[PDB]
């Protein structure tokens, strides 16, 4: 409108909102569909749900490879959104009980889920990188605000999805049975609308082309670099001053520098799966903590489950508050938050949140009687301080990570560093699954462990962020 912000990002943030809406509206009904429509084992349903989630987490690698190495982006977004819409069509087609039964339903549902995972993994990094591409490299201050608005759109989509999903699967009969076809078709229409609105802004975008088979060049350059050193019975200059400088008889400098930056950022990101796994162990145990504390609140009775909704709402409140007030106040003085101090401070805040959760659990345990009521029974409040701290950590770490991934990536591989950021979440999710079964510790002792682990992870990231060499 005025300046410094293209009209294009309007059909980027809206698309992201519409996509998250549909994704969270479908994933919510997925498990009920498995259990009460397909009539699957609990083990089978949970395993299929977790496999689908993991594939969704892991596919953005393929999406970013396709985008950067070939076809550019805004063409991988379009085609993978078409694949996403096809997957939604199949999934909603398999929930119709009229045609086929127990075999067409299973096949169509599984194929649709595979296509949905493919689409999501390739709309995730490409859309963020494409929206970032709309700003001139000099406008590095408007890009951060755009990324804040992008995260706000994500969280708003999640919140409206949570608030609107139970209405669709509430006492609706498709054909003499519970209506799952609508529950899966509404997300399909939302995805179709997202694709339409994104395509509507084609003439305004700033589509840049790919810089060649960048992924193959990167792999071959790394392979040559590693292979050169193997001078078992010889060697006078295998590689000095770096492990890539003597992969220079080919792979000109403009590629060696790009792979250097890529490897630097990847080594920096190494520790983030542990942070993601540790911070993901709060939406399950905090529910157990809530179940042990009063939730009448005088005005409105609060069920422990509903407290989960306090995270997206607090993110919505904190994003504008952080960007427009707190960061400006910090900038008032000489204090300089370098986008890596922000992430470390977010990790410290998450550690503090888990320590506060441990303290609240300790207070809960120390109950003694004076239907008998324990005098020292905490209200569902006192869960606010940990929700405030953990939410501020997510705003600082997550919004800063998207910008850091883009600003530090070579132009040839802008969406590959976005896949690297998403790859940490994918690996972190695997850690949660591998460690979920191992649970035999007290709630207070567990939180004091996660707080301590989250501290050690932050010291490792802080030390490696100190020696990081920024891209230039």
């Amino acid at each position, epitope marked *: 409108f005025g300046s410094s912000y293209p009209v294009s990002i309007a059909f980027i943030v809206v698309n992201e909102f519409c996509e998250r809406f549909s994704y969270y509206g479908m994933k919510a009904v997925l498990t009920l569909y498995f259990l009460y429509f*397909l*009539h*699957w*084992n*609990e*083990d*089978t349903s949970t395993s299929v749900y977790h496999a689908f989630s993991s594939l969704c987490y892991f596919t953005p690698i393929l999406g970013a490879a396709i985008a950067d190495s070939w076809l550019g982006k805004f063409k991988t977004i379009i085609y993978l959104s078409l694949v996403y819409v096809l997957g939604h069509v199949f999934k909603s087609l398999g929930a119709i009980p009229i045609l086929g039964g127990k075999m067409l339903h299973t096949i169509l549902s599984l194929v649709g889920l595979s296509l949905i995972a493919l689409g999501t993994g390739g709309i995730k990094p490409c859309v963020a990188a494409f929206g970032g591409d709309q700003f001139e490299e000099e406008h590095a201050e408007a890009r951060t605000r755009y990324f804040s608005v992008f995260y706000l759109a994500i969280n708003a989509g999640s919140l409206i999805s949570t608030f609107i999903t139970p209405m669709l699967r509430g006492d609706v009969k498709c054909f003499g049975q519970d209506c799952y076809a609508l529950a899966f078709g509404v997300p399909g229409l939302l995805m179709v609308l997202a694709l339409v609105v994104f395509a509507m802004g084609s003439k305004m975008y700033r589509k840049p082309p790919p810089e060649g088979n960048i992924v193959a060049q990167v792999i071959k350059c790394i392979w040559f670099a590693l292979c050169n050193r193997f001078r078992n019975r010889s060697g006078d200059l295998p590689k000095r001053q770096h492990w890539l400088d003597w992969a220079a008889e080919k792979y000109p400098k403009h590629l060696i520098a790009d792979v250097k930056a890529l490897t630097r950022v990847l080594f920096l990101y190494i520790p983030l799966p542990m942070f993601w796994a540790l911070l993901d162990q709060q939406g399950s145990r905090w529910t157990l903590q809530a179940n042990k504390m009063n939730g009448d609140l005088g005005f409105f009775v609060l069920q422990p489950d509903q407290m989960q909704v306090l995270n997206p709402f607090l993110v919505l409140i904190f994003i504008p508050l952080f960007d427009l007030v707190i960061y400006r106040l910090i900038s008032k003085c000489r204090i300089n938050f370098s986008s890596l101090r922000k992430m470390a401070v977010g990790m410290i805040l998450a550690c503090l949140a888990f320590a506060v959760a441990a303290l609240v659990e300790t207070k809960i345990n120390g109950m003694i009687h004076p239907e008998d009521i324990p005098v020292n029974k905490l209200s569902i409040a006192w869960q606010l301080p940990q929700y405030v701290l953990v939410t501020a950590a997510e705003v600082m770490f997550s919004v800063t990570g998207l910008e850091f991934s883009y600003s530090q990536a070579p132009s040839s591989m802008k969406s590959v560093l976005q896949a690297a950021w998403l790859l940490t979440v994918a690996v972190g999710n695997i850690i949660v699954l591998v460690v979920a079964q191992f649970s035999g510790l007290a709630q207070w002792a567990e939180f004091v462990l996660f707080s301590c682990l989250l501290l050690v992870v932050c010291l490792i990231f802080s030390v490696m962020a100190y020696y990081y060499v920024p891209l230039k």
Partner: nanobody, 123 residues
Framework: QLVESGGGLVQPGGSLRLLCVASGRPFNDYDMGWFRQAPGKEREFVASISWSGRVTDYSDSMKGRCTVSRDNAKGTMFLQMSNLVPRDTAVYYC????????????????????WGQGTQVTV
């Protein structure tokens, strides 16, 4: 393994509370389901309770209101039929299936592999 059952005659609009005790491998390793076989009829699905009792399902009829519970300690399973009628005067069976990965419906006979003998609840 070695499931059992217990129950008997009931009033036209009374209620019944059936038992199913496992006398073998631990009860937490088995998905359980209730079936009925009216005289001169095919076996019908009644209710199903998964391991840990987290997931429960009831037949479309669910005459009145059924409720399946299970305590994996002592391995006992309960079915609470509430508003019985002149119908459903069938022989009620208990079925157990070891946990595994399968795509067969949890509300079908072929899903279950240990059908214990059945009661003779009548109305």
């Amino acid at each position: 393994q070695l499931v059992e059952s217990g129950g008997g005659l009931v009033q036209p609009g009374g209620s019944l509370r059936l038992l199913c005790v496992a006398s073998g491998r631990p009860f937490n390793d088995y998905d359980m389901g209730w079936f009925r076989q009216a005289p001169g009829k095919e076996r019908e699905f009644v209710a199903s309770i998964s391991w840990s009792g987290r997931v429960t399902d009831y037949s479309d009829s669910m005459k009145g209101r059924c409720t399946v519970s299970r305590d994996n300690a002592k391995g006992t399973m309960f079915l609470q039929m509430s508003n019985l009628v002149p119908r459903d005067t069938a022989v009620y069976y208990c079925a157990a299936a070891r946990r595994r990965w399968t795509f067969k419906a949890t509300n079908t006979e072929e899903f279950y592999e240990t059908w214990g003998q059945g009661t003779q609840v009548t109305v």
